[PDB]
Symmetry: C3
């Protein structure tokens, strides 16, 4: 199959980045929904590397207020190794989460094989809090801080993160869907001059202009791999309610599909994260099914499924 | 009343273009909602040509996988005759469906009186499958194939369709709202070079640019008649749930009203189809009422009802 | 605090401008939701002038079809005096309604201190019916007609309104969100040549272009105080269902936040009305809260709360 439709699926059943149980069932519910089968139906070369075990770390005291540092640290270190293995096999790494702290490992591992990569971060949250700016202490709101080169000297020695080396510069990341940012995070976002399209920008410009600007900002100088880190809470909770930190006034089902359709069209998608699907956080069994279906739809669009339609290079009027 | 406000209403209680029962009740639920009365309230000259009787064809064997060919063929043939009669009487034909296979008859009947007409097709689906590309065999998903001049020779001899003559060229149709297109249909669109605004285009451009481009593509050379074929599943199932083939991520209530408001403003609406309203597919009685109300609102906008407001040519302050 | 964040709160528990009971509980439910506390949390200087006592007028006969004229007349006369007092104290007047007839008093009282003010009217309705064009006889659908200078000679001697002097010209008002306009109102709108962005315009242009044009139309010549009169039914009933006259196809939660965010950014907000919140019209206990939370969110955006985030002028990376 073509490069843009060759896929290495990694299940990352991990939850200790945040306090709500159930996010570790994300790989299980996404698979049961028939993700692998639906991708193979759209001419994809899919290989399943299974679910990473993430063996228990019973002795994992907090670093100041930062909860489960060694667990989050080790899960991300093993994900890095697995993502790098998938990348070396000439496959787009498809990380099924799991909480967004796993992005430390996903982007790090991807950058080991492709150091020139650019990040598109779809989320309601910046996840750029450092272990010292965080007020919650939940590492799922800190991944970007461990990855940025400009934040070196501002990240303290956190147990389980000594393997981490900042791999991305402030200029190679674009945020889309922002609407819930902490004071410390907003300060980081402005002082470093990170490119962002909050909900305000999406409202002002329209998702067409947002995507046109996002892709020109990151690819204008030179074509390079794209790493899309998709947090389902980035979409409005009317489409993805079964998630840990939902915020009203989010990206629509259409905007979510438009972002992913545009990234596919570049033929440069190299890494993908489908994060924060928590099937225990539905209010009804339908809310869970609605979130999973939306997450599956976003994923299919990342690998070629277009609303206008798709067809094989054959004559349909004379079979 | 003005030409843009003179209507000939045709009831088309037909369902055999698809397998789900209840879509034949569409003319009944749209009328009960007070469509005729509400149109007369907005200074429309309304003439009701009634509901067409669709006689049973008991031995209507399938053409390959294509279900009920003679039934779908005869219903359209009847609709074509009625639409032409309405058009000759200087009226805008308002077809109350019924499934989308009735578009074969609606557009054919309209083209007999106005051959230079342009088609605006609002829908989640292209309905351009031919009897040979179709996988479902449901005729409601093949009306455009029978109408296109470029597909002459690609349509086999289907029982009940020998009266059909392709009346529209690939350059005379614009699609709005596409989000569920079959491989064969996508091939047809691309090879014939049909103009389309799928949900991707609506997201990219905005409905303002979509309409500006749709109307310029069609009338740019000179003014010509407009046939709007409105399938309620073109709109999102949060506004029109009571329909046979609903697809998520659809046109909003606002986008639907914006398309119809822009078409009204041209004063060139000559034919209208309000299709696929199925009152048996509402999960609650409210889902049915919501779909009917949305369909009625779309129809009123086609004949002048504007969100900014409307007023009679009199002095309201004196 | 900053002028744009120095606020004076006025409670206006009044309902006799329409026939549905409960809209007088609007100030009570908005306060209970913690509006004052949330504003002080975003560095606002908040002063509460309390709830205006609206004494009963037992012998209130209708003027033709116009219901409760003296009651509506006296309530706005009382509000005008209070708004003017708040304005003289160098504060942004924040009127918590209450039905939209109170806009007669809110805009009048504001114009006594700032006569060059511009009005942004966020609503589904024009509220421009005169006491003679109205078919309902409900004064909350008439405040604009009492305020316009061009409609002087067309407003009859209505009991309780002799204190009223038209303070705004047709060129000084912009409508946003219109979708339910009476024939008489549409005639007034067109004959006077009032600037408006009905839902048709919002769909055509996008809220970005709508706001850019609204602010340019009013502030292009000279900076002037902005009076935002926000009726919650201007937003779609999926966000504000607990309201008297809901109309489908309204402004989204995002569009509402975008309008208010843009008005804040000018630093020229001088008067604000949060009207038609009726907690008795919520089909479930959930519908009231949704409407209330939405109204509180709109208000916070008017005084600085931004979706991209906010931060204090301190170095967060080096405390
Ligand atoms: N910035 C947060 C954090 O934990 O740092 C604050 C938060 C808790 C209270 N208000 C929202 C959650 C947010 C982190 C979001 C992490 B996510 O992976 O879902 O983007
Ligand atoms: N192209 C379809 C067909 O029946 O040909 C296939 C369909 C069934 C399963 N996938 C979508 C329905 C579609 C026909 C749509 C007809 B309609 O009037 O609703 O637009
Ligand atoms: N123009 C109205 C009026 O009473 O003037 C007519 C109305 C009643 C039935 N149809 C809509 C209500 C509208 C006025 C609404 C007042 B409001 O402040 O909520 O806009
Ligand atoms: Mn996240
Ligand atoms: Mn998030
Ligand atoms: Mn159709
Ligand atoms: Mn359809
Ligand atoms: Mn109002
Ligand atoms: Mn209103």
């Amino acid at each position: 199959s073509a490069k843009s439709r060759t896929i290495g699926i990694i299940g990352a059943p991990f939850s200790k980045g945040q306090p709500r149980g159930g996010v570790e069932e994300g790989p299980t519910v996404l698979r049961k929904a028939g993700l692998l089968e639906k991708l193979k139906e759209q001419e994809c070369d899919v290989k399943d590397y299974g679910d990473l075990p993430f063996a228990d770390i019973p002795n994992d005291s907090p670093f100041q207020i930062v909860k489960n540092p060694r667990s989050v640290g080790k899960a991300s270190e093993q994900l890095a190794g697995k993502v790098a293995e998938v990348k070396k096999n000439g496959r787009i790494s498809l990380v099924l989460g799991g909480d967004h702290s796993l992005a430390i490992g996903s982007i790090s591992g991807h950058a080991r094989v492709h150091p020139d990569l650019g990040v598109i971060w779809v989320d309601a949250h910046t996840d750029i809090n450092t272990p010292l700016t965080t007020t919650s202490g939940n590492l799922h709101g800190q991944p970007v801080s461990f990855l940025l080169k400009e934040l070196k000297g501002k990240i303290p020695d956190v147990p389980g993160f000594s393997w981490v080396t900042p791999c991305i510069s402030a200029k190679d990341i674009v945020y889309i869907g922002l609407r819930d940012v902490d004071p410390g995070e907003h300060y980081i976002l402005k002082t470093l001059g990170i490119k962002y399209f909050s909900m305000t920008e999406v409202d002002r410009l329209g998702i067409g202009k947002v995507m046109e600007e996002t892709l020109s900002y990151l690819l204008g100088r030179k074509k390079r791999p794209i790493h899309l880190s998709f947090d389902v809470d980035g979409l409005d909770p009317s489409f993805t309610p079964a998630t840990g930190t939902p915020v009203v006034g989010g990206l629509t089902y259409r905007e979510g599909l438009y972002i992913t359709e545009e990234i596919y069209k570049t033929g440069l998608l190299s890494g993908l994260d489908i994060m924060e699907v928590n099937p225990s956080l539905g209010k009804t069994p339908e809310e869970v099914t609605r979130t999973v279906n939306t997450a599956v739809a976003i994923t299919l669009a990342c690998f070629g499924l277009a609303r206008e339609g798709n067809h094989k290079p054959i004559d349909y009027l004379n079979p």
